Paper text:
In a double-blinded, placebo-controlled phase 1 human clinical trial, the recombinant, germline-targeting envelope glycoprotein (Env) trimer BG505 SOSIP.v4.1-GT1.1, adjuvanted with AS01B, induced bnAb precursors of the VRC01-class at a high frequency in the majority of vaccine recipients. These bnAb precursors, that target the CD4 receptor binding site, had undergone somatic hypermutation characteristic of the VRC01-class. The GT strategy for inducing VRC01-class bnAb precursors is rooted in the hypothesis that these antibodies target the CD4bs with a similar angle of approach to VRC01 and use the same conserved contact residues. To verify that VRC01-class mAbs elicited by GT1.1 do not just exhibit similar sequence features to VRC01-class bnAbs but also target the CD4bs in a similar manner and with the same atomic contacts, we selected five mAbs for further structural characterization.
Moreover, VRC01-class bnAbs have very distinct and targetable genetic and structural characteristics. Specifically, they have restricted immunoglobulin heavy chain variable region alleles (IGHV1–2*02 or *04) and a short five amino acid light chain complementarity determining region 3 (CDRL3). Finally, GT1.1-induced VRC01-class mAbs are structurally extremely similar to VRC01-class bnAbs. A subset of isolated VRC01-class monoclonal antibodies neutralized wild-type pseudoviruses and was structurally extremely similar to bnAb VRC01.
Author numbering:
A (entry chain H): 1 to 52, 52A, 53 to 82, 82A, 82B, 82C, 83 to 100, 100A, ...
B (entry chain L): 1 to 91, 96 to 197, 202 to 211
Amino acid sequence: QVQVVQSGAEVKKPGASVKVSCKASGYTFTDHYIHWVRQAPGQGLEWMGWINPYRGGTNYAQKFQGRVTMTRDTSINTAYMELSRLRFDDTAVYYCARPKDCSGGSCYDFDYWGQGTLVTVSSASTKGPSVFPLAPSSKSTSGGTAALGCLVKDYFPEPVTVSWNSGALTSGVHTFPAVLQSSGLYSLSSVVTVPSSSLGTQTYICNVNHKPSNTKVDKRVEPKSC
Amino acid sequence: NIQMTQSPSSLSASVGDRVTITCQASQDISNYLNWYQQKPGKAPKLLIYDASNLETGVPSRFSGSGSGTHFTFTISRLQPEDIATYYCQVYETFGQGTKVEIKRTVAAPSVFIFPPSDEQLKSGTASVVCLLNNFYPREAKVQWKVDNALQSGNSQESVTEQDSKDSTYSLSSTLTLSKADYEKHKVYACEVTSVTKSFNRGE
């Protein structure tokens, strides 16, 4: 199946450079152009430029001209986007996309997108998260419904993803967006509501992944006796 | 070169009715306009290409029309999973976007409160979490009372996007205290406006 997979999120200091990879599979890498589109937090989509994998020709928007470099390695079907002299407002999710087949010479119908790559331009260092249980108890039980979860505290940079029972538990799950604490580190909670009659019978494990620190945590949340 | 004017900036509609969004190009672009759906935390997903053609795999309730400078994107019957921001785009220019939201009936939140875990207390910090589950509309005020004393400046709120199934929101309020301060007080109350959920530290 046609897939386009990018490299993981990372934090880069101001004035440094970042290079995001974009690996294409399931189709002839040279038959389609590779475009890059970025999105600042809470903003729209901004086209950066394209590269032709066949010969390597590029075309950059004048905003990034002289500051961006798009290359490719056909032997591994990977395109690269290097952004140098990083500004604080370069913090964005960076996507790569390929267009559909067309004969007009300008194909811009982006039919496959990469998952994106969050680049945080900050001097703060990477810190792995601490995961604590949010144990269900009487104070976490309303009616016949009980609430439980995991607290993911003091990590940097974003993002962390949370699943439950390795993806087998999705109904009732709410993974809140991270909040930026005054300390400069992020924190979020992931919760799920389940029947109170399943406490002590069903096993509930939260799977917290923080790729920037290469850290995965699986914690079983156990009921309280109060 | 080309400027796109997308309208409306945002809209709210009920499940089943017709959602309509327009884009105006600064110059004749023939039929070379595309429409994308971006769910929160997700990459954009192509829905309509060349302004009229349904992209392979896209449900038939999505459609587009227009040629030249005036274009339209339509969802025939809005579904709960269609909560997203939609973009039009020609060549190198993306429209400003339209955040479509669901109007639904009022739902009261289910309020839960979690005392700090013993594991976190060993680290010298206490986080107490108040959860507002599956409520509508989004407006809600949450405040913290510690031994019946109003708190300020030591709590942070986080609200999820509208749920893809029941169109409700969820909110979390996290009161952060030092370990010494947490053991210095007894009653920890979360007030949601108006209902109260509270616990005692020793219990």
